[PDB]
């Protein structure tokens, strides 16, 4: 008849075990579904509990039903930031009537990745052409730190988002703020939210090393053929130079 | 396990599957039967070799496996992943190899120098 | 069996549910997790043989995969006429030097 989930929101660090409960007012049912939505993009479900089944397990997901107690539980083991999504609970009546499911309000979950080496800093991206805006980036902040909106309408600050880089297996958090008009030096932009005092503010002076640049060098076939053309031209140049010198000696003799 | 013997000669690619003595063999690539019919002259099957002509890097690179004839796709347990780039009349030379011709070119020239000087 | 390997940003990795057993070839490096193995840059021609058991329905299973990457960072373009051109140029040059030392002698 009605479905209630408890709680509605949840925020936990990664690796923790999670307990989620779903409730129904009628035990005369034959179905149980758990859906995933993030944030829309359709609804994905990997679970199925039947009235004749007590416990269902798939992957890292546990589920239990108690029709007599009118309770349903979902267990998450070693929660990961990829589990941050909206979870739904659905039921269907046992009687052969209209077969209408009664979805619940839904439960929202956010999982904070555990950063191993915090390194808060604010970097300024160089303005691109055909654009009058300036963008600065605040990144590698610890998960307990968190930002808020600006105090003026001409400055736009986005919320923090988690990034996954499979090549280096790294996880990071970052936020982006941009404004169009006046004095937008991001040494003052991130103001409404307290940031750690050790946050790195790089100087406008730029420096870099050629050693890191050399690591990115690569080769192509046409360049190789051009190089062999170079070597060949040097060979013929030395040969003709030797003959020329020999002729100078002969004619001067 | 005996490695796959692969040979490249320009845009022609030859695959060898010495894992069986022979008398029956069949190939598969990206879940489709390749090399079982004569109707395509671009590709061909030998007693132990599979021949590809004007090999293309982008859409012919993937998994290759020997069945062999009479076997089933799922029972295979040793696959080869190949992705290679090639051009017409593109051969392979290494740094040490290209250094050899330079020295002998001087070496032969030394041979000419000693004998004409005698005349 | 299918041993999945991915090609993220000029690096090549071998991904399996479990540990990776190494057979002769490029050893590479291991990431923070043992289940994934890194083979380095793509244009360095990573060649080797590797082994790994799967999970769920596959366990227990033996799997072997051979990786063969042939990039042409060390290749050149020259049709036979062009080749014959270079050998012709060198032979006439060498004969030219021979003529020069003939005049010297």
């Amino acid at each position: 008849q009605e479905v209630t989930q408890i709680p509605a929101a949840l925020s936990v660090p990664e690796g923790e075990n999670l307990v989620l409960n779903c409730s129904f007012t009628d035990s005369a049912i034959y179905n149980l579904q758990w859906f995933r939505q993030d944030p829309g993009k359709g609804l994905t479900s990997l679970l199925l509990i039947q009235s004749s089944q007590r416990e269902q397990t798939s992957g890292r997901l546990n589920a239990s039903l108690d029709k007599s107690s009118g309770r349903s539980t979902l267990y998450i083991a070693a929660s990961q930031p990829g589990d941050s999504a909206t979870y739904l609970c659905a039921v269907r009546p046992l009687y052969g009537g209209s077969y209408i499911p009664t979805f619940g309000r839904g439960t929202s979950l956010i999982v904070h990745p555990y950063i191993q080496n915090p390194d808060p800093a604010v970097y300024q991206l160089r303005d691109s052409k055909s654009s009058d805006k300036s963008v600065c980036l605040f990144t590698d902040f610890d998960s307990q730190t968190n930002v808020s909106q600006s105090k003026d309408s001409d400055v736009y600050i986005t919320d923090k988002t988690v990034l996954d880089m499979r090549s280096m297996d790294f996880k990071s958090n970052s936020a982006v703020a941009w404004s169009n008009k006046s004095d937008f030096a991001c040494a003052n932009a991130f103001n409404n939210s307290i940031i750690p005092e050790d946050t790195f503010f790089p100087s406008p002076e730029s420096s870099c090393d050629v050693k890191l640049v050399e690591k990115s060098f690569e080769t192509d076939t046409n360049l190789n053929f051009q190089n062999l053309s170079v070597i060949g031209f040097r060979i013929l140049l030395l040969k003709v130079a030797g003959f020329n010198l020999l002729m100078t000696l002969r004619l001067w003799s | 396990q005996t490695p796959y013997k692969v040979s490249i000669s320009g845009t022609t690619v030859i695959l060898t599957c010495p894992q069986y003595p022979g008398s029956e063999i069949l190939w598969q690539h990206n879940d489709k039967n390749i090399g079982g019919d004569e109707d395509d002259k671009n590709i061909g099957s030998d007693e132990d070799h599979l021949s590809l002509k004007e090999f293309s890097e982008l859409e012919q690179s993937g998994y290759y496996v020997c069945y062999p004839r009479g076997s089933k796709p799922e029972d295979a347990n040793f696959y080869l992943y190949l992705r290679a780039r090639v051009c017409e009349n593109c051969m392979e030379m290494d740094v040490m190899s290209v250094a050899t011709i330079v020295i002998v070119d001087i070496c032969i020239t030394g041979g000419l120098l000693l004998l004409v000087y005698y005349w | 069996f299918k041993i999945p390997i991915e090609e993220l940003e000029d690096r090549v990795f071998v991904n399996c549910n479990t540990s990776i057993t190494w057979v002769e070839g490029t050893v590479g490096t291991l990431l923070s997790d043992i289940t994934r193995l890194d083979l380095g840059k793509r244009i360095l021609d990573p060649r080797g043989i590797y082994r790994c058991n799967g999970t769920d329905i596959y366990k227990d299973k033996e799997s072997t995969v051979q990786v063969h990457y042939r990039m042409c960072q060390s290749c050149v373009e020259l049709d036979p006429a062009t080749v014959a051109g270079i050998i012709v140029t060198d032979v006439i040059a060498t004969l030219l030097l021979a003529l020069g030392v003939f005049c010297f002698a």
Partner: peptide, 30 residues
């Protein structure tokens, strides 16, 4: 880093043909 045969060792190879050759004929005036 992948030079192929664009390796700098080729860049300083042919100048050797005049380098180690030059260091030998310098003995003529000593």
């Amino acid at each position: 880093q992948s030079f192929g045969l664009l390796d700098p060792k080729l860049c300083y190879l042919l100048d050797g043909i005049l380098f180690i050759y030059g260091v030998i004929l310098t003995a003529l005036f000593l």
